Amino acid sequence: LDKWVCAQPSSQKATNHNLHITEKLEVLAKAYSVQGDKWRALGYAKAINALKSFHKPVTSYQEACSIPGIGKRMAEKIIEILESGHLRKLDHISESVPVLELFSNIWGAGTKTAQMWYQQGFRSLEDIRSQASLTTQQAIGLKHYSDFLERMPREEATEIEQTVQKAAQAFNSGLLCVACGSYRRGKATCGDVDVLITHPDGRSHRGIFSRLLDSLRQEGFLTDDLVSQEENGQQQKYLGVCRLPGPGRRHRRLDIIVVPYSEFACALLYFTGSAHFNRSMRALAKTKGMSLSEHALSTAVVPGRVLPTPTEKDVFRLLGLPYREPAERDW
DNA sequence: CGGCA
DNA sequence: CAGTGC
DNA sequence: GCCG
DNA sequence: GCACTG
Numbered sequence: 001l002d003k004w005v006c007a008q009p010s011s012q013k014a015t016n017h018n019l020h021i022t023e024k025l026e027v028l029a030k031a032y033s034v035q036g037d038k039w040r041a042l043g044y045a046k047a048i049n050a051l052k053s054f055h056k057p058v059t060s061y062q063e064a065c066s067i068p069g070i071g072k073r074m075a076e077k078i079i080e081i082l083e084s085g086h087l088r089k090l091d092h093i094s095e096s097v098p099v100l101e102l103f104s105n106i107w108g109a110g111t112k113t114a115q116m117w118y119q120q121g122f123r124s125l126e127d128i129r130s131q132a133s134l135t136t137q138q139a140i141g142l143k144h145y146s147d148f149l150e151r152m153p154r155e156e157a158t159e160i161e162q163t164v165q166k167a168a169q170a171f172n173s174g175l176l177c178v179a180c181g182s183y184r185r186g187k188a189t190c191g192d193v194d195v196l197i198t199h200p201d202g203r204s205h206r207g208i209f210s211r212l213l214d215s216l217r218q219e220g221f222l223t224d225d226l227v228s229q230e231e232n233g234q235q236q237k238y239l240g241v242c243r244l245p246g247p248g249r250r251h252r253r254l255d256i257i258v259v260p261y262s263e264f265a266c267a268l269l270y271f272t273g274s275a276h277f278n279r280s281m282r283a284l285a286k287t288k289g290m291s292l293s294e295h296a297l298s299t300a301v302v303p304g305r306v307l308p309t310p311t312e313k314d315v316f317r318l319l320g321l322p323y324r325e326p327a328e329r330d331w
Numbered sequence: 332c333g334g335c336a
Numbered sequence: 337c338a339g340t341g342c
Numbered sequence: 343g344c345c346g
Numbered sequence: 347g348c349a350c351t352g
């Protein structure tokens with residue numbers, strides 16, 4: 001269990017005894033990430049979380065290797081940093097990385113698009129604005145480039161959640177609306193607001209997206225849509241942009257998901273995160289012959305069985321994990 | 332060797 | 337499908 | 343990158 | 347691990 005972050009409280013990271021290592025490794029991890037070397041970047045990310053939660057400063061190659069998530073190669077970098085105070089590789093990162101990071105911070109442009117723009121000679125957002133062929137999503141991402149990189153005070157996230165909740169409950173007073181993500185995990189600032197909507201009668205969540213989005217558009221609250229499949233009535237998620245009324249307001253990202261009550265615990269667990277907490281818990285489930293999604297915890301396919309999970313605690317229990325409140329899932 | 336949700 | 341983001 |  | 351685009 002020591003090897004699974006989802007089995008451990010994330011508060012272990014608040015006492016990082018190895019910051020002089022992790023701040024350097026994070027530079028490299030991001031360099032691999034924006035260049036598209038996603039699995040190497042994942043290994044770095046996991047190693048950083050292992051170093052952040054370790055109980056003491058690492059001081060030997062043997063100690064480092066013993067830590068789950070640190071191997072020979074990562075141990076060698078750790079030993080370099082301690083002796084020399086520096087990591088030579090940081091002076092030999094691809095010169096494209098700063099521009100790739102600039103470009104992949106456009107919403108809807110990932111590593112493949114950023115690398116293509118770089119190959120085509122683009123180096124600035126002015127080059128993108130004037131010369132690139134943007135998708136509809138990427139054009140919205142660029143228009144809101146700075147605002148999507150800002151985090152909002154959690155008090156503003158509360159206002160946004162309440163705006164959604166009031167619009168929803170206006171046409172069905174029984175709808176339950178909960179802000180998840182970093183808000184539910186108790187963070188002081190939030191990159192966006194992630195709102196989960198359900199109805200305890202098990203049926204009246206159906207079809208609400210059309211009414212809800214139209215309502216939020218009527219009041220001018222929604223300003224742009226990034227993902228919203230409104231054509232066939234099977235919509236599960238909305239990703240877009242909102243802005244509260246009055247002066248001094250920024251455009252803020254807003255995510256909504258609507259789920260049947262029978263899936264509430266698994267949807268709440270997914271949407272609360274964190275992302276690395278979810279990936280850890282889902283990996284653990286696989287080792288136990290199970291599969292965990294926002295819909296269900298289910299046994300391996302043959303057509304698996306859906307396990308009964310009325311509450312988040314039941315998912316933890318079925319995976320043999322001690323329960324963690326949302327604030328302790330911040331991996 | 333291959334997954335890594 | 338590949339690419340993208342939650 | 344690391345893991346089984 | 348899933349739901350989106352085009």
Ligand SMILES: O=c1ccn([C@H]2C[C@H](O)[C@@H](COP(=O)(O)NP(=O)(O)OP(=O)(O)O)O2)c(=O)[nH]1
Pocket residue numbers: 180181182183189190191192193194255270271272273274275278279342
């Ligand atoms: O890769 C991901 C990203 C998110 N998620 C889940 C967990 C996350 O907490 C939730 C909302 O995604 P956000 O991108 O909104 N992240 P979060 O709310 O944790 O942080 P932020 O403050 O940046 O929005 O979706 C994943 O499972 N995998």
Ligand SMILES: [Ca+2]
Pocket residue numbers: 181192193194255342
């Ligand atoms: Ca979100």
Ligand SMILES: [Cl-]
Pocket residue numbers: 031092093094
């Ligand atoms: Cl590099």
Ligand SMILES: [Cl-]
Pocket residue numbers: 265268310311312313
């Ligand atoms: Cl619950």
Ligand SMILES: [Mg+2]
Pocket residue numbers: 180181182183191192193194
């Ligand atoms: Mg969020």
Ligand code: NA
Pocket residue numbers: 064065066067068069070071
């Ligand atoms: Na190790």
Ligand code: NA
Pocket residue numbers: 103104105106107108109110
């Ligand atoms: Na992007």
Ligand code: NA
Pocket residue numbers: 191192
């Ligand atoms: Na974010």
